[PDB]
Amino acid sequence: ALPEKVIKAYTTVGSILKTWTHGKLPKLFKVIPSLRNWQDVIYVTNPEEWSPHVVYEATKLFVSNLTAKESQKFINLILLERFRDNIETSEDHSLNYHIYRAVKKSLYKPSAFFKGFLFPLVETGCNVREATIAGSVLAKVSVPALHSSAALSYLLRLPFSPPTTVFIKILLDKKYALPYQTVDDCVYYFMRFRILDGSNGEDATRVLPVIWHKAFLTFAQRYKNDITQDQRDFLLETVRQRGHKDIGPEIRRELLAGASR
């Protein structure tokens, strides 16, 4: 257990943080990232009762002063939870703009964001509104092609869900250069929703949302020249079996306009 001087001091800073909106953060709060056991002390400040102002400033403070591994824990244990809590309990299921900007700031350490925020989110019942808000952050902030690609590969290997597909589409829309292994993962992903006349899983017949088709189309526009002829044929077949009324022809068109790598 903690020294009672610690508990007493950081219980009070905790109360200050409930209503803090401007000025300098309490000095004792600003030394927390300089502490080895910052996790033990931070909890005493009662993070879930911090003002949204403090969430923002704390995110700046902690993400830029902790190591990536440590940042990742902050992002996950505090930022992510606040993001979800606030969206679920608000009357219009919107995110307070301070928290919103906190999530943008956390993308400055893209690896701590993907491991601390995004992957836990899509793997723990992310809903469509959560993916739409977090997705808009991901769309607006530049991320290194390398980390972007690696996150795309990770999401493509996950089981299907519409919110995951939202993020997949966002990362495709970045239209960054992709390592050929991520291109391959994209092909394998869209492929796996086709019907193989023997063994099929749910993906072959499940209903596909419009967002899956826009993702397919996006991948087709940007990356038509980076796939093999074999891969082009699997995707053209995917569009034949699973294509969409309006988007399907566009996808086919883009796929046929591509030259093999």
């Binding site: 993907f114 390398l146 690609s149």
Partner: peptide
């Protein structure tokens, strides 16, 4: 490069 980082993600 990508080799390094994808394993850290997975």
């Amino acid at each position: 490069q990508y080799d390094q980082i994808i394993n850290g993600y997975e």
